[PDB]
Design a binder for this molecule. Structure first.
Ligand SMILES: [Zn+2]
Lengths: 43, 48, 100, 112
RNA sequence: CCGAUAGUGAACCAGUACCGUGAGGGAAAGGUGAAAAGCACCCCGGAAGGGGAGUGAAAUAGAACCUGAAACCGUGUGCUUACAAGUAGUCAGAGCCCGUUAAUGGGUGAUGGCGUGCCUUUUGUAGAAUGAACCGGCGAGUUACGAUUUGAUGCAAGGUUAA
RNA sequence: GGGUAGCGGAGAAAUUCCAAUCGAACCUGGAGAUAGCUGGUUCUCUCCGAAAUAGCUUUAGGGCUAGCCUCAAGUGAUGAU
RNA sequence: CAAUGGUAGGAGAGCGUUCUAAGGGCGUUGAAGCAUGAUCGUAAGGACAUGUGGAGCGCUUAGAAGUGAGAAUGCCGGUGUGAGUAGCGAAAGACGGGUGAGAAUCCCGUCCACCGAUUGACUAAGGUUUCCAGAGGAAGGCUCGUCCGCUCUGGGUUAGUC
């Protein structure tokens, strides 16, 4: 059976990722939130 | 299909009354004073 | 601390108390001088790369500096130490006699 | 007098070691060496080098005479268990126990 | 005020293993000894493990290393048991084995009498109505303000202050 | 390789699919939503000790007042046979 | 002299647990905790002796509370029963020699089998050192293991035209 999640390096970085996040006002809110929690990776 | 009560320790040790093993035949060898199984070769200077 | 690497001291605690000795190394971070002849040790000298199988290797172990007290030179008995400024520098004095 | 030997955390379930110890309990050590090397069970090679080490402790450390030595006590104690898993049919796991054993063997010349 | 199931999620290389495409969710895990003085050397074994010797007050204080409960798993034994119908006890009671916080003692137990768990919920449960596999931890009428009633204390035609 | 996003998309139409989910996805917050319903609520002795009935109620497996219990301070034979 | 069965409930008197005040005590000649015992009080409960343990802890009067568990298809840990039971994941091996403490299972040989529009050869994506050579056998491997995609310490990817 085909499963969800067929991985894809370039799709992964265009939908989730630093520049995509820093493009929207709500994406910068995600990254602010993860910084005050102290996550080791932000995106 | 599934146990209705647990098994007590008493009832478990009675079922295991017969779960044991016996020693082998294991006679002494005439060539070397030793021990070997009956009707098999000796594992010590193999003679028969 | 208040004891240096050359002073001769007495031991006022431990099982080797009442012994006069000389100081040979201080170890100030953990506060434990190594006096000569006190606190003898028995280490198992294993076979080394450039040594033999050995035996027991006698040596000295550190001692807490609170179990030691200097010796004023005149009377030769234990005493605390103070300071008085002379020659522009700091100077140890024996609290019951003159300078060290 | 008595002499002792132990093997700690031998990776065999204590139920399985115990079948073979009930064969040599109270036997003369010359006959029990042969029972263990003429038996087909997995613990037999392990148990007999606990038995030979106890006979060696008897002659070297205690100056005994191996001819009249006997197996006085032989037992297996539960050692600590490892935790493992087995995947099952529809997303669920089940528990495996990897159980160990402490083994003790006492020999004695039977005197006082 | 807490004292390692507590106190921060985190006393420890914690927003970390790990889980999720992502937003996000989110642990477990402290203690050698005063001092490493951390077991030279011999013996069995391929090693692991062990028995001695030694260091130390102490080594079941030997690195999962303060103490070490219960459930559970064993080894040895004193009394008992293969004609018997058991909610497993209790009251009566021989025979045998022991000897105390020394008092009309302790262990076992042939045989006799009488005896259908506990909780919850119900008119009524041995219930074939509910819940619990066992052991351990820890898990539910608090205290702020206001009202009322009772006790107890000061003062009394007066009593009492708030910021 | 791209685009359509939940008070929304997509649908040769089945209440079908939108990350093993869909009569309205998932995650965080308001938040200890509310729960006249079920389940739990932990030491010991002593004294007393009942109700499953009126009446009203979008009210009958809920509630309120009275009837029946207790404790205290009064009244003083007014209770029973 | 008289009273004393008791659920829902009302009322009274107490036992024990942590912390504080004041007073007075005990502890390396061994405190607390733990274990065992044939002891004491009307109950909740209190002592004493020994064993282990290694530094703190009771008593009296008063005060203050995260103050007492057998039940919640309770929460977390760790141990049973079922039980030496089910299973051990599509398909063919045999023998000889060798290596080793240990061989059905590792290496070499011969024969036999199986796929062959594929169980062969390439290559995108994806994965990121699994690649190679020496060494190892704790755990992983559904058995074993002297072996390994596992552990150890040394290496390995070369472009004007792909
Ligand atoms: Zn022979």
């Amino acid at each position: 059976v085909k499963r969800t999640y067929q991985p894809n390096k370039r799709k992964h970085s265009k939908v989730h990722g630093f520049r995509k996040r820093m493009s929207t006002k709500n994406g910068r809110k995600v990254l602010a939130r993860r910084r005050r929690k102290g996550r080791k990776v932000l995106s | 299909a599934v146990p209705k009560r647990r098994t007590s320790k008493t009832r478990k040790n009675k079922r295991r009354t017969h779960f044991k093993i016996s020693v082998p035949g294991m006679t002494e060898c005439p060539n070397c004073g030793e021990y070997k199984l009956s009707h098999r070769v000796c594992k010590n200077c193999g003679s028969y | 601390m208040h004891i240096k690497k050359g002073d001769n001291v007495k031991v006022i605690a431990g099982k080797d108390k009442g012994k006069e000795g000389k100081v040979i190394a201080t170890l100030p971070k953990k506060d434990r001088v190594v006096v000569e002849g006190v606190n003898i040790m028995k280490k198992h000298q294993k076979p080394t790369q450039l040594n033999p199988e050995g035996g027991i290797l006698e040596t000295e172990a550190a001692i807490h500096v609170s179990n030691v007290q200097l010796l004023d030179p005149k009377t030769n008995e234990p005493t605390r130490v103070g300071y008085k400024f002379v020659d522009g520098k700091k100077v140890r004095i024996a609290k019951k006699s003159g300078e060290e | 007098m008595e002499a002792k030997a132990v093997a700690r955390t031998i990776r065999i379930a204590p139920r399985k070691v115990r079948l073979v110890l009930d064969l040599i309990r109270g036997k003369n050590a010359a006959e029990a060496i042969a029972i263990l090397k003429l038996t087909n069970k997995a613990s037999s090679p392990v148990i007999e080098k606990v038995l030979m080490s106890a006979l060696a402790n008897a002659e070297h450390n205690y100056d005994m005479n191996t001819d009249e030595l006997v197996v006085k006590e032989a037992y297996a104690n539960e050692g600590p268990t490892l935790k493992r898993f087995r995947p099952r049919a529809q997303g669920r796991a089940s528990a495996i126990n990897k159980r160990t054993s402490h083994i003790t063997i006492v020999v004695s010349d039977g005197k006082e």
